Design an enzyme around this catalytic site. Structure first.
Site, PDB file in Angstrom:
ATOM      1  N   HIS A  62       0.873  -1.172  -0.002  1.00 19.38           N
ATOM      2  CA  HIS A  62      -0.054  -0.083   0.221  1.00 19.38           C
ATOM      3  C   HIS A  62       0.862   1.352   0.031  1.00 19.38           C
ATOM      4  CE1 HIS A  62      -2.146  -3.050   2.649  1.00 19.38           C
ATOM      5  NE2 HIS A  62      -2.691  -3.249   1.501  1.00 19.38           N
ATOM      6  N   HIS A  92       3.107   9.512   5.401  1.00 16.44           N
ATOM      7  CA  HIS A  92       3.330   8.693   4.108  1.00 16.44           C
ATOM      8  C   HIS A  92       3.036   9.364   3.082  1.00 16.44           C
ATOM      9  CE1 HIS A  92      -0.614   8.504   5.229  1.00 16.44           C
ATOM     10  NE2 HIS A  92      -1.130   8.245   3.857  1.00 16.44           N
ATOM     11  N   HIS A  94       1.462   9.260  -1.322  1.00 15.62           N
ATOM     12  CA  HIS A  94       0.552   8.352  -2.325  1.00 15.62           C
ATOM     13  C   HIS A  94       1.036   9.187  -3.603  1.00 15.62           C
ATOM     14  CE1 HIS A  94      -2.628   7.313   0.583  1.00 15.62           C
ATOM     15  NE2 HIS A  94      -2.253   8.467   1.271  1.00 15.62           N
ATOM     16  N   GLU A 104      -4.028  12.675  -4.247  1.00 13.16           N
ATOM     17  CA  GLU A 104      -5.506  12.220  -3.656  1.00 13.16           C
ATOM     18  C   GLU A 104      -6.586  13.273  -3.978  1.00 13.16           C
ATOM     19  OE1 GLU A 104      -4.837   9.804  -0.028  1.00 13.16           O
ATOM     20  OE2 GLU A 104      -5.312   8.230  -1.485  1.00 13.16           O
ATOM     21  N   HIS A 117       1.013  12.924   3.603  1.00 13.48           N
ATOM     22  CA  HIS A 117      -0.045  12.990   4.597  1.00 13.48           C
ATOM     23  C   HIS A 117       0.635  12.817   6.090  1.00 13.48           C
ATOM     24  CE1 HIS A 117      -3.437  11.286   1.763  1.00 13.48           C
ATOM     25  NE2 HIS A 117      -3.013  12.509   1.620  1.00 13.48           N
ATOM     26  N   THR A 196      -8.131   7.889   4.085  1.00 12.45           N
ATOM     27  CA  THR A 196      -8.277   7.474   2.506  1.00 12.45           C
ATOM     28  C   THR A 196      -8.149   6.073   1.918  1.00 12.45           C
ATOM     29  OG1 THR A 196      -6.090   8.100   1.618  1.00 12.45           O
ATOM     30  CG2 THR A 196      -7.929   9.902   1.601  1.00 12.45           C
ATOM     31  N   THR A 197      -7.763   5.189   3.183  1.00 10.04           N
ATOM     32  CA  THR A 197      -7.476   3.802   2.989  1.00 10.04           C
ATOM     33  C   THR A 197      -8.298   3.069   3.980  1.00 10.04           C
ATOM     34  OG1 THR A 197      -5.380   3.705   4.581  1.00 10.04           O
ATOM     35  CG2 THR A 197      -5.233   3.730   2.086  1.00 10.04           C
TER      36      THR A 197
HETATM   37 ZN    ZN Z   1      -2.222   8.914   2.971  1.00 13.55          ZN
END
Ligand code: ZN
Ligand code: HG
Length: 258
Positions: A62, A92, A94, A104, A117, A196-197
């Site tokens: 992920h 982390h 994306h 995102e 994030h 968002t996950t």
């Molecule tokens: Zn994130």
């Protein structure tokens, strides 16, 4: 099987195991700069990261998380639309397979190369597990990355990615200063949303910075060399680990700047 970002287990499938996916305050969303209301009563953000203690970096499938020691008020976020103190637990990113996608959140439908994030949890709740169960449990600071010149402060992260190439790998990562990843302005947009996950819990107060930070093509390229799979399993490059914008529904995006 386990959720992911592929054709068969991607974002469009998440609702089957996590009904909250079709929820009322889901993230990310598209920020329409002409519809966001300037709120004069929003206070400046207060970022106190001078005593931050990074501990480890890990590839969890992920994405990759840089973890911090959140046992004390070492690195905290206050001010802005927040009530109380929020401790930094991890950060982390994306990113996409190409420079034109990866973020995102989008600004006027524009996608950036990646999105950082910085996840914090409300100290009032004692621990992150309890915090996720609350409407105001988390505060996530979102920073957009665009490709241009290198970000010196991001290089330590880039150089260690080789050792955490596959799912489950971790590496000691001490003395990393998160202040090196901040843009110079702290102007922002804020709205109530969710992780968002999966589990996609609607416990987040989103704070998205207006000013993006620049990273070099070579820096983003190294993110793209990571793997979703574990050692020994067939190779699937970790790219496009982003969830597309969700409907805003009954929400208003407020801006700290006019
Ligand atoms: Zn994130
Ligand atoms: Hg919640």
């Amino acid at each position: 099987h386990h959720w992911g970002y592929g054709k068969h287990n991607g974002p469009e499938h998440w609702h089957k195991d996590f009904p909250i996916a079709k929820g009322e305050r889901q993230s990310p969303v598209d920020i329409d700069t002409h519809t966001a209301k300037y709120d004069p009563s929003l206070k400046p953000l207060s970022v106190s990261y001078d005593q931050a203690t990074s501990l480890r970096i890990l590839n969890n499938g992920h994405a990759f998380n840089v973890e911090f020691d959140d046992s004390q008020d070492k690195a905290v976020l206050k001010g802005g639309p927040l009530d109380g103190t929020y401790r930094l637990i991890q950060f982390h990113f994306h990113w996409g397979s190409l420079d034109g996608q990866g973020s995102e959140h989008t600004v006027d439908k524009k996608k950036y190369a990646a999105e950082l994030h910085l996840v914090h949890w409300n100290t009032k709740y004692g621990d992150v597990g309890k915090a996720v169960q609350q409407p105001d449990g988390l505060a996530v600071l979102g920073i957009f990355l665009k490709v241009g010149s290198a970000k010196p402060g991001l290089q330590k992260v880039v150089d260690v990615l080789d050792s955490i190439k596959t799912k489950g790998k971790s590496a000691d990562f001490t003395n990393f200063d998160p202040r090196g990843l901040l843009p110079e302005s702290l102007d922002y947009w804020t709205y109530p949303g969710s992780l968002t996950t999966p589990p996609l819990l609607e416990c987040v107060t989103w704070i998205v910075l207006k000013e993006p930070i620049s990273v070099s093509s070579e820096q983003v390229l190294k993110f793209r060399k990571l793997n979703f799979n574990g050692e020994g399993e067939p190779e699937e490059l970790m790219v496009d680990n982003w969830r597309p914008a969700q409907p805003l529904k009954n929400r208003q995006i407020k801006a700290s700047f006019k």
